[PDB]
Amino acid sequence: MEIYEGKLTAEGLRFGIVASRFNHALVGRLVEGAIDCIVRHGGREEDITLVCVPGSWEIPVAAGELARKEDIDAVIAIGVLIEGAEPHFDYIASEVSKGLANLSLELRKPISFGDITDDELEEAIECAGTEHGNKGWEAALSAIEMANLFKSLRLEHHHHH
Amino acid sequence: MEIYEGKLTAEGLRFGIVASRFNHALVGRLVEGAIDCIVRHGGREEDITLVCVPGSWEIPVAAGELARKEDIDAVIAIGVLIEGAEPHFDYIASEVSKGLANLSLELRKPISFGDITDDELEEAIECAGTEHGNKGWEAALSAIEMANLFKSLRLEHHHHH
Amino acid sequence: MEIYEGKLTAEGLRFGIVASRFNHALVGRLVEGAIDCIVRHGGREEDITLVCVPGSWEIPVAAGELARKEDIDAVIAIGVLIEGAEPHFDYIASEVSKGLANLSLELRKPISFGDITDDELEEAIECAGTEHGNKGWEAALSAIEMANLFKSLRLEHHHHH
Amino acid sequence: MEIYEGKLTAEGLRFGIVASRFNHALVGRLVEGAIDCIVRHGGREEDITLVCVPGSWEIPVAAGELARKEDIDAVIAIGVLIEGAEPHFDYIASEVSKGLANLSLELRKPISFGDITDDELEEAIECAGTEHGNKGWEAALSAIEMANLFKSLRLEHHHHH
Amino acid sequence: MEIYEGKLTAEGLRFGIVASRFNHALVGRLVEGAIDCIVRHGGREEDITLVCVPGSWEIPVAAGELARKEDIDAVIAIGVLIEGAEPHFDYIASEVSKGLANLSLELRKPISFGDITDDELEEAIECAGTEHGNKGWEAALSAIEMANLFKSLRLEHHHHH
Amino acid sequence: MEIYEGKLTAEGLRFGIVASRFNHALVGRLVEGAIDCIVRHGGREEDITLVCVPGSWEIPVAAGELARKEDIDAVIAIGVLIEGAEPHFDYIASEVSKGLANLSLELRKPISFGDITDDELEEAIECAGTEHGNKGWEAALSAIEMANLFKSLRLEHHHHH
């Protein structure tokens, strides 16, 4: 049986990172969370690319830019949404949610949802902590597994040729 | 690492402004705040493109033209939705969110969201004084940063070229 | 500064009108109002294009055709949805809201929303006589402004050329 | 009428920063607050100058050094005073307050009071937060506006010559 | 960025010490702590200049001479004000604060403030043991850092010269 | 500054695994998790050395041989001590801690501590599912990082040579 999965070795991959700077009290923590899991899983960082924007709203349009470059294999969503305004948390969270999704099906490039949607500030204190459930740590890893996977898909296509 | 973010200088930039005239008593308040922050951050006010429409519904179709100009770098969404007609606030406001979203993702050109969602008119008037919650003040500023960012994105591509 | 808007003259213009025939009691009354504003506000009726269909479902597919003809400048969407069957008013009305929306944004052509959501025939009669509240009348007005506005956008585009 | 005010573009300006390292739990936050508003308002940072001292007491003598150099246009006061001892909070706060003031009238150079005088540790947690009321953000901006202003004063003097 | 701060090596530095002999039972305690930290941080104790005066009042006029020596790099203020005479504690202590302040700002030479403000004598004796709240210990250390800082300031000027 | 830390690639590394067969119902669970994370992080499973012993006591003497191989870079301690015999849990478990400690310090070769200390068997079974508290999962990962670290330590010595 033909099976594809991914090792977690970040050797050879060049990554995309988009970060909101709204409530940077948690964003700095996650941003580093991803960079860590990247390089501490073997990947170099001169190939990582970080773009910063105002708020959760703009993350879509940025990733769409990042995924279109030839030399970015996978892109990491990064933001924190605190229930500040229900128009902005319900609409902007689902709109970016689906929005990123449709980018990926469209550009054929893996996007991880590195968002911490906390209903309260306390849930915001739990997930950027010590237990190594640093959402950036995790979504960074999902991206590496998906990076080596689509490198496993397209490699098992291009080299077999 | 290769990082991109935008400064807020409005020099050399030509902006888009779309305006609903539903609830004009505060709308005038907003565009003032908008063009204010634009011009103060150094950008000339003759490159502003300002378009007027009836109610919140046409907000999309206007901007869609504004962006397809080669010479409008970013567009500032401006309108007010007060709960007048609740079928019109759920469908029109969310459709404003999505419609603007997908135009920006599509044209790869940023559109800010100068949208004041007030239930009561007093919460509007309170927020345009000197604390600059003049939502246009900020939606203008976001548009500047994103403007310089895509001019930072694509220009680090075309000059390195 | 450069400001774009649209006057209320229907001169030089060719419109679209799409009509459902469910509850036609009220449709007669509203298309009447719609054609009142066009011809009274400067238009000749010789270029009013009237397409009729069964029920509210088929509204989109029609206007999409009326918008792909070169010589239809704006399409006046007109139909009545009354809370008969909750499956059909929720999903079908939002599918009209959205369906029309993405039409105009795609095609870059103004289509306005003359859809009266009412609960009783008596609410229709009130608006039919003389209360200056024929919602098709208003949809005809909004579309006139958008037509002359887009004639103001597109004509200030091609004349300065 | 002859009017002078300032845009906020930090292009061409070289700044002064003095920082107390007492209660650095908030000082790091503000220090970055100023640097941000500087470079994200266009200013380069190779021209910023940072000097660090023990406590609030020494900020005067340092700014007096910084303002006397030819190539520093504006200087940013930075410190946090927590009501630790009433001899030291009443005397050192008013003494630096007036002390900085007399420096500026004397060296003819603008000094912003970038101090957070918190009566409690809770007020210390409020002002270094997310709402973009990061006292360093603000006093940095006051300095840029005053920097371009005295560049507007002395420029409207020196070039008219 | 160009940043300046001082290390604490006392090597190559010649210090000033002014001492009130009002309340000498703890004053001896202090200067010990002072010269201690000076000499331990590597600086030789023969370059110390130690001046004795009656009560707290003359503290200023002494230092003012000490600084006008070319060869005293910094001066350590040392005296104790216990609430003995409250007209003498408000006016003399605050005048010590201001007078020393303005001498330092004037001569552009730092003067630390080894001032113990005790209401009760027991809070004095408790703070000179091994936890080094020996206020002289610290006022000495501040003077070192500021000493190396102005020797860092003006020497990065005269050697780059 | 010269900083050393290890990435987690298992490529080019040959590992040690020592296993007690006291309480084998969960021990099999562990080594699975161990070799899993080893092989997934890119390292080949034929360089694994796996040694089986009776109860927790021999855990030391086994590893002591495993390390004295030139070609085992690190060794993974694996065993389970459930409170069965409390004289055997105090003396054997602590002696496992010290004995392994001193072998690692002595041979200058790292030995991880895949030791599950469960009082109840249910707390064991709960922690081997997908949250990867599969203590072997982690003790394996620590061994990788330390492996690459000493290969980072001594190799930054022998190649700079």
From Swiss-Prot, chains A, B, C, D, E, F:
Positions with a binding annotation for 5-amino-6-(D-ribitylamino)uracil: F22, N23, S56, W57, E58, V80, L81, I82, F113, K135
Temperature dependence: Extremely thermostable. Has a melting temperature of 119.9 degrees Celsius.
Stored Pfam families: DMRL_synthase
UniProt keyword annotations, A-Z: Riboflavin biosynthesis, Transferase
Top enzyme category: transferase
EC number, as in UniProt: 2.5.1.78
Metabolic or biological pathway: Cofactor biosynthesis; riboflavin biosynthesis; riboflavin from 2-hydroxy-3-oxobutyl phosphate and 5-amino-6-(D-ribitylamino)uracil: step 1/2
Keyword check for Transferase: yes
Name the record gives this protein: 6,7-dimethyl-8-ribityllumazine synthase
Name of the coding gene: ribH
